[PDB]
Amino acid sequence: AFDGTWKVDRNENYSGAHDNLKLTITQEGNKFTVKESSNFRNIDVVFELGVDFAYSLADGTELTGTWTMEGNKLVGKFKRVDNGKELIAVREISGNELIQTYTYEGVEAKRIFKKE
């Protein structure tokens, strides 16, 4: 749980570099980075667990939050004040994988992926 790579593997794969997600988390003593590979380069979210902070992410973000990894959960809350105004990731490792329910202004947008 939160210990190794996750997802995606489209054949050998050629060049180009296109919307190549993949998760990979591996806590190591309050140091869990998450492999939020998305449509904003790979980009990682590093820090030391229950480590609050105002950290940019996509040169036009302001994800200010605090992930307080609780074993199998992912409580905290980051927002892009400037416009997204909320892009939490309320979530817990469903079971042999994760979703990531981006809690946004009232909605529960869950992305459905997993692990490899």
Annotated binding site for hexadecanoate: 67, 91
Residue from 48, 17, 37, 16 nearest 116 by CA:
37
Q: Give the separation between CA 116 and CA 111, rounded to whole angstroms.
A: 16
Experimental method: NMR
Q: Give the separation between CA 83 and CA 22, rounded to whole angstroms.
A: 26
C-beta atoms surrounding 25 within 10 Å:
22
Q: Name the residue ranges covered by the structural domains of the chain.
A: 1-116
Annotated binding site: 67, 91
Strand partners, 101: 90, 110
7 touches 116 (CB < 8 A): yes
Is domain 1-116 classified as CATH 2.40.128.20? yes
Residue from 80, 71, 74 nearest 101 by CA:
74
Q: Which amino acid is at 37?
A: S
Annotated binding site for tetradecanoate: 67, 91
